[PDB]
Ligand binder design. Structure first.
Ligand SMILES: *C(=O)CCCCCCCCCCC
Length: 11
């Protein structure tokens, strides 16, 4: 839940 659609911004 912390990044299920946000890993390319949080690289
Ligand atoms: C949400 O984005 C999923 C990935 C983030 C890491 C979850 C870590 C906790 C897993 C164990 C839960 C009991």
């Amino acid at each position: 839940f912390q990044w299920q659609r946000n890993i390319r911004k949080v690289r």
